[PDB]
Amino acid sequence: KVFGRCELAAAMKRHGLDNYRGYSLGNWVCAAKFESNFNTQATNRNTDGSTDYGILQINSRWWCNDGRTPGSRNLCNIPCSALLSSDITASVNCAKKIVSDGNGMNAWVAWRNRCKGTDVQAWIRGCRL
Numbered sequence: 001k002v003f004g005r006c007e008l009a010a011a012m013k014r015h016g017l018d019n020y021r022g023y024s025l026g027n028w029v030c031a032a033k034f035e036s037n038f039n040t041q042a043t044n045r046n047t048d049g050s051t052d053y054g055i056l057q058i059n060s061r062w063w064c065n066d067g068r069t070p071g072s073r074n075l076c077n078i079p080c081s082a083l084l085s086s087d088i089t090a091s092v093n094c095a096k097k098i099v100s101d102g103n104g105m106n107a108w109v110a111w112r113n114r115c116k117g118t119d120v121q122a123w124i125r126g127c128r129l
């Protein structure tokens, strides 16, 4: 599924991400835009053989099981395929564990490089939330 901007803002709020760990909804929407372009089915292989999955590009190195990332963990206790669903529940639940891990949203390098410090409220501007 390819979400619209306000459609994703609304879904992230419905699953409790708005202001989760102090990160406003615009931060989450901006991170999704630059990680996946709002596409739930996005996958990208890393140089080290791990893969990033879904709207928030969650990495098999630590968070999900894809069966092909040697020495990896599965800390969200989910198959990485669950992160590709039209329903974002599994991605949100896992993202809440990642952002609690100690470095906040810096875990998402695209958030650090393209969202952190910027006018992230623009991402929810006009949305009926």
Ligand SMILES: [Cl-]
Binding pocket: 005, 033
């Ligand atoms: Cl957009």
Ligand SMILES: [Cl-]
Binding pocket: 024, 025, 026, 027, 120, 121, 122, 124
């Ligand atoms: Cl915001």
Ligand SMILES: [Cl-]
Binding pocket: 065, 066, 067, 068, 069, 070, 071, 072
């Ligand atoms: Cl594996």
Ligand SMILES: [Cl-]
Binding pocket: 072, 073, 074, 075
């Ligand atoms: Cl594990």
Ligand SMILES: [Cl-]
Binding pocket: 065, 066, 078, 079, 080
């Ligand atoms: Cl699995």
Ligand SMILES: [Cl-]
Binding pocket: 011, 086, 087, 088, 089
């Ligand atoms: Cl959803």
Ligand SMILES: [Cl-]
Binding pocket: 021, 022, 103, 104, 105
């Ligand atoms: Cl933080």
Ligand code: NA
Binding pocket: 060, 061, 062, 063, 064, 065, 066, 069, 072, 073, 074
């Ligand atoms: Na893994």
